[PDB]
Write a protein that binds this ligand. Sequence first.
Ligand SMILES: CCNc1cc(C(=O)N[C@@H](Cc2ccccc2)[C@H](O)CNCc2cccc(C(F)(F)F)c2)cc(N2CCCC2=O)c1
Length: 370
Amino acid sequence: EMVDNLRGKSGQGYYVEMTVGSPPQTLNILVDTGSSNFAVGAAPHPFLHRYYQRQLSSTYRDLRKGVYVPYTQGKWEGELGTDLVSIPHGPQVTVRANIAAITESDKFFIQGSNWEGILGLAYAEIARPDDSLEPFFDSLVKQTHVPNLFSLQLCGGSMIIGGIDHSLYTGSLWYTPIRREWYYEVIIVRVEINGQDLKMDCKEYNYDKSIVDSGTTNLRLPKKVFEAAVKSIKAASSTEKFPDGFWLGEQLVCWQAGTTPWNIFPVISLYLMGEVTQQSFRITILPQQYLRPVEDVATSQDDCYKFAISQSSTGTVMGAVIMEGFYVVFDRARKRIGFAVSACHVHDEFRTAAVEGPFVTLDMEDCGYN
Ligand SMILES: CCNc1cc(C(=O)N[C@@H](Cc2ccccc2)[C@H](O)CNCc2cccc(C(F)(F)F)c2)cc(N2CCCC2=O)c1
């Protein structure tokens, strides 16, 4: 009953239905493995269809404390409290959880996104104001019998809480360690484009850190890695020349509807650290994943795309365009992240996204930046 419980607009995140307060107030909530605060619009906003009305909830308790969260994109401020929360198409349990009532925001809410709040599924260490603010999922596990694990299939999509749904993937699940419980931090040991190694010290791939983040759209890479990746993708696709603005992820590239030259763009392989010494596996991404379609009736004689790999100064972010087409298991109990090929990945008659291994490495260097 939990399958297909996610919806979204491409590039604007995936959300699940929740209710807050007594009696229940229904809100759509973006599912974000890249942060740790549960926050909802709680005052009118031009982009909000509805908002949390605390005065209508008898179970709301005010914590008398402000809170501010600045993301990579957007920021909000609000007031902390607790209230009862349920997930109509998730586990059938109700829990009292911390809630940030958003009273002011900047470039956070998105016009036409259909969500009104955000659910930070990461660990308390990155919660604001500090790590004493118990995140939602921790409250859920403490207060119910739900196993300490959830999984995401981003396609619509599914968030499965408490277990793994085999109907949602094919082949084997491969696991990489959660290096530290704050973000869902992982370690990338190798990157290949078109099968060719980028040939960098593997610590470069994880400077400052590397995270798995359903709340970010792009694959974001450290400057040095990004520039190397772009050079290699340009080389592979050199039969066509695009404006610099495209590689900067600023402007679109368009082709006559139906004629996107997928075959001229390379596959990208990210090798993740395995659970055993010097073993790894790879996840492979097709251009259908990293060239993000931009819907616009005005340009609809064409198919137009943005380049959804972009530069970061805060480490690697494996965002939605990496997670789409994979079934991703956040196995908190065993401190590991699993990847498998999703039942709903996008590909063609020539190439298919994959999760595969094992791969061994002779060089024993720790790829963690520290
Ligand atoms: C889905 C919308 N598209 C996005 C969203 C975000 C982004 O910053 N997402 C946030 C939250 C968010 C979710 C939805 C809307 C707005 C914010 C996520 O928590 C960051 N994790 C990491 C993080 C970073 C900083 C602070 C935190 C903290 F923990 F919350 F404090 C977390 C970056 C994008 N970018 C930017 C350029 C490339 C790209 O794809 C595109």
